[PDB]
Write a protein that binds this ligand. Sequence first.
Ligand SMILES: Cc1cccnc1N
Ligand SMILES: Cc1cccnc1N
Length: 165
Amino acid sequence: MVNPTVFFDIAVDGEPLGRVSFELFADKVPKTAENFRALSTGEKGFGYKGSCFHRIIPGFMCQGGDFTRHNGTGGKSIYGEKFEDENFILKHTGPGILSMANAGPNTNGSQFFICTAKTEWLDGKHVVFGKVKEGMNIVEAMERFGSRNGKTSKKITIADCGQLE
Ligand SMILES: Cc1cccnc1N
Ligand SMILES: Cc1cccnc1N
């Protein structure tokens, strides 16, 4: 009934940086929320722990969740390789929005992005399913290791992750 909360403990070239928590909008996009939740606990036998934010563009977004290819070409959902666009009820309203990366209609896997600006042109194209709850300062710290083309100057990893409460 209460939207679940997940955390990522972030590291920068293996050094602890801090924790980012997310609210997942299970109330609005249950299927998409449950995928991310489960990938964050690792309870299906695979998931985000030890993966990296392979593409970070300051003033746009931090993208991750490619635990099979490590570069934006991989990843898989708890439902199969890909799953449908659940709905587009929620919009890309500003920094902190958590949304699904994809490669076309109905191609959600595990890759996601955290917005660091309003990205309204993505509305109706990417499924928004959560928001940063605590540690937007850590996201901003992460964002500083990105670049215009998205290549990071240090390796930004999810050293640990899971579900809070
Ligand atoms: C999007 C999707 C869902 C289930 C099976 N195949 C697919 N491509
Ligand atoms: C396979 C893939 C590539 C880029 C974004 N999402 C995906 N599921």
